[PDB]
Amino acid sequence: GAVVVKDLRKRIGKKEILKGISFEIEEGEIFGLIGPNGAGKTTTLRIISTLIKPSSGIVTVFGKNVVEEPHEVRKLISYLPEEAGAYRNMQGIEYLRFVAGFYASSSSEIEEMVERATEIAGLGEKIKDRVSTYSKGMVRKLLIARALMVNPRLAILDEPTSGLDVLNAREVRKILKQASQEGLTILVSSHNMLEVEFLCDRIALIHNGTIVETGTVEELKERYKAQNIEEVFEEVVK
Amino acid sequence: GAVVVKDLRKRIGKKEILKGISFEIEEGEIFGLIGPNGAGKTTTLRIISTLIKPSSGIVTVFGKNVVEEPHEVRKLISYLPEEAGAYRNMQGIEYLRFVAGFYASSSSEIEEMVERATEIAGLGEKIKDRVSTYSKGMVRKLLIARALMVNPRLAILDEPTSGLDVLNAREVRKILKQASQEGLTILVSSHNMLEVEFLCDRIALIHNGTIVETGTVEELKERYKAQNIEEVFEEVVK
């Protein structure tokens, strides 16, 4: 329903990066496109977000073809690229005001966005500190807050927990899970196969630009008699 | 059209042999399901022939669901398992009469089958010799003749050229190509990736029970800048 990818191909330079992949994401869930570095996850997530176009195949977001109706699609999505940063010479709350202003000019809408963001970030009084003082995990919470504050129907997050220590990765997972429990559909990319069971409801395993399996995390574990997703992946691709 | 496989899974014992595979075969072509030993090709070909049932997914042969209408499907197909043999203590022509008798009792139908078979086999006067005197390649031509003599709409051949020397493999390829040029749809399985360009119009590359690519042989070569299918396969799965 929420996202349907059908025989998606994408050439970049000499390479067929995506090799005719298919999968579907259900409304209201956290879906993981999971695989090692170089598998094509970023390209996939970027095509779904309308930033780049397919070479062929069809992608629909909530029933809207992303190539035929991109306008309608973009009204529904928010994309956060991997390792996004924020402007360091602003307070957190100031950064959030600034960016909220891209989306709207009305004080009311800006205020609403900023207050949603502050509440998602969970930075306490530190939101009034300069971003240059923030740890990596704080920047990441600020950025995800910023992606989520526009109340998208679908959030597309490229490696949301990469680079994070144990505590911050857990807080980020918490944020995403709460957001999905409030109705948000989230497409994440990740190469951390142990942690995927504690974040995603369903996954597509991707290898060299091919989907080698899909299902709920539990289905896959039961299907391959595997206690974790890295074992599934390994079982499936050699 | 001719065969459509959709999310086909099949468990055997502890193993998910087929891992939700999809592909389609066009009427009148030779299609190759291509991959190494153990990839799941025989199981696939057997499910399509109605001999074993899916665990899940859907297979249709000329629009007939093989699970809902197996009767209608079997009227359309002929399956030849890998390394099939013939009864050695009969003349070739005698073996062909005997087997034709399984399919029909009428002299006319038996005669027609036997004459089609003799013409496909191309064994000349050797068809009157005992099968015990036949070379491997002669047995193989006799068996393929036997599969094809019933005029199926779809022939499903499991590794039709395996074990064969250069000459006999070439004659078998000739037989299949001629038969397809006369309207027959042929599904073959093979692990000989160099020879697939000289037999198949389209292929699905299969690895560990997953389809990792599909297309015409030329499309795949052009897509992966590869001069042969073994290079494509290698490029695609690691």
Side-chain angles (χ1 to χ4, degrees), chain A residues 1-5 7-125 127-238, chain B residues 1-5 7-125 127-238:
Chain A
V3 181
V4 183
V5 175
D7 303 325
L8 172 60
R9 341 264 321 192
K10 178 70 175 182
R11 182 191 60 78
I12 297 171
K14 270 199 78 135
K15 296 178 194 151
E16 237 253 346
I17 297 307
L18 305 182
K19 297 172 168 75
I21 70 176
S22 293
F23 68 91
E24 178 191 311
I25 301 186
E26 304 327 303
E27 183 170 57
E29 71 174 24
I30 301 183
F31 187 99
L33 180 68
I34 309 308
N37 290 323
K41 311 181 291 291
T42 286
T43 291
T44 304
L45 270 59
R46 286 196 186 164
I47 289 171
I48 288 164
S49 84
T50 88
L51 222 30
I52 70 204
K53 297 300 172 247
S55 300
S56 70
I58 295 153
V59 185
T60 68
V61 171
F62 296 105
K64 312 301 212 175
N65 186 309
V66 303
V67 175
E68 295 167 9
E69 298 150 284
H71 178 15
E72 293 284 52
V73 168
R74 282 190 289 266
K75 280 141 112 180
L76 304 171
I77 79 105
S78 190
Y79 171 61
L80 180 63
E82 168 160 25
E83 292 271 312
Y87 183 68
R88 323 268 108 212
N89 320 327
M90 270 180 203
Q91 309 190 338
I93 188 81
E94 177 179 22
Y95 167 76
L96 292 179
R97 264 151 204 163
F98 177 54
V99 172
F102 304 160
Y103 293 91
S105 51
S106 112
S107 285
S108 182
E109 301 180 67
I110 288 170
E111 189 60 28
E112 170 168 341
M113 284 177 72
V114 170
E115 292 188 355
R116 285 193 188 285
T118 60
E119 161 173 32
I120 298 163
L123 298 175
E125 278 312 293
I127 195 74
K128 304 174 85 181
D129 295 346
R130 277 201 138 98
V131 164
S132 60
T133 69
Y134 285 17
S135 69
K136 184 187 184 115
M138 294 172 68
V139 174
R140 186 68 108 280
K141 288 196 293 161
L142 189 68
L143 266 293
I144 291 174
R146 179 257 171 274
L148 271 48
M149 81 183 172
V150 306
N151 263 359
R153 269 161 69 53
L154 171 69
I156 307 176
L157 310 173
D158 204 339
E159 310 272 356
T161 63
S162 85
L164 294 183
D165 65 10
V166 166
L167 183 75
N168 290 112
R170 169 160 96 250
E171 299 160 4
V172 164
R173 285 194 311 263
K174 212 184 165 153
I175 289 164
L176 301 186
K177 277 144 95 163
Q178 165 154 320
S180 197
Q181 287 171 21
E182 295 175 2
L184 183 62
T185 308
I186 305 178
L187 167 58
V188 308
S189 70
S190 178
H191 64 280
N192 182 352
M193 300 195 184
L194 294 175
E195 299 293 310
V196 295
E197 56 179 81
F198 310 123
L199 183 56
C200 296
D201 306 298
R202 295 172 60 244
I203 68 178
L205 293 176
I206 189 168
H207 180 252
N208 306 339
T210 66
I211 301 306
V212 295
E213 257 288 38
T214 63
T216 67
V217 164
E218 198 47 47
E219 267 166 10
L220 283 174
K221 286 160 70 164
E222 303 191 325
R223 188 177 295 148
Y224 298 102
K225 271 74 194 88
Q227 282 161 23
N228 77 72
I229 291 292
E230 195 171 278
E231 300 182 334
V232 171
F233 189 88
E234 291 182 8
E235 198 137 349
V236 172
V237 313
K238 235 176 254 282
Chain B
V3 181
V4 183
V5 175
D7 303 325
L8 172 60
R9 341 264 321 192
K10 178 70 175 182
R11 182 191 60 78
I12 297 171
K14 270 199 78 135
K15 296 178 194 151
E16 237 253 346
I17 297 307
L18 305 182
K19 297 171 168 75
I21 70 176
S22 293
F23 68 91
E24 178 191 311
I25 301 186
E26 304 327 303
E27 183 170 57
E29 71 174 24
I30 301 183
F31 187 99
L33 180 68
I34 309 308
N37 290 323
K41 311 181 291 291
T42 286
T43 291
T44 304
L45 270 59
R46 286 196 186 164
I47 289 171
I48 288 164
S49 84
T50 88
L51 222 30
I52 70 204
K53 297 300 172 247
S55 300
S56 70
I58 295 153
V59 185
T60 68
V61 171
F62 296 105
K64 312 301 212 175
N65 186 309
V66 303
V67 175
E68 295 167 9
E69 298 150 284
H71 178 15
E72 293 284 52
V73 168
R74 282 190 289 266
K75 280 141 112 180
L76 304 171
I77 79 105
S78 190
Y79 171 61
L80 180 63
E82 168 160 25
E83 292 271 312
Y87 183 68
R88 323 268 108 212
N89 320 327
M90 270 180 203
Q91 309 190 338
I93 188 81
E94 177 179 22
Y95 167 76
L96 292 179
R97 264 151 204 163
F98 177 54
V99 172
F102 304 160
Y103 293 91
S105 51
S106 112
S107 285
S108 182
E109 301 180 67
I110 288 170
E111 189 60 28
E112 170 168 341
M113 284 177 72
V114 170
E115 292 188 355
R116 285 193 188 285
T118 60
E119 161 173 32
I120 298 163
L123 298 175
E125 278 312 293
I127 195 74
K128 304 174 85 181
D129 295 346
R130 277 201 138 98
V131 164
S132 60
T133 69
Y134 285 17
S135 69
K136 184 187 184 115
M138 294 172 68
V139 174
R140 186 68 108 280
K141 288 196 293 161
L142 189 68
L143 266 293
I144 291 174
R146 179 257 171 274
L148 271 48
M149 81 183 172
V150 306
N151 263 359
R153 269 161 69 53
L154 171 69
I156 307 176
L157 310 173
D158 204 339
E159 310 272 356
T161 63
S162 85
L164 294 183
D165 65 10
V166 166
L167 183 75
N168 290 112
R170 169 160 96 250
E171 299 160 4
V172 164
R173 285 194 311 263
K174 212 184 165 153
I175 289 164
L176 301 186
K177 277 144 95 163
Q178 165 154 320
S180 197
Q181 287 171 21
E182 295 175 2
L184 183 62
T185 308
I186 305 178
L187 167 58
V188 308
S189 70
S190 178
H191 64 280
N192 182 352
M193 300 195 184
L194 294 175
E195 299 293 310
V196 295
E197 56 179 81
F198 310 123
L199 183 56
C200 296
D201 306 298
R202 295 172 60 244
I203 68 178
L205 293 175
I206 189 168
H207 180 252
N208 306 339
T210 66
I211 301 306
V212 295
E213 257 288 38
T214 63
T216 67
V217 164
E218 198 47 47
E219 267 166 10
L220 283 174
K221 286 160 70 164
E222 303 191 325
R223 188 177 295 148
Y224 298 102
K225 272 74 194 88
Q227 282 161 23
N228 77 72
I229 291 292
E230 195 171 278
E231 300 182 334
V232 171
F233 189 88
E234 291 182 8
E235 198 137 349
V236 172
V237 313
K238 235 176 254 282

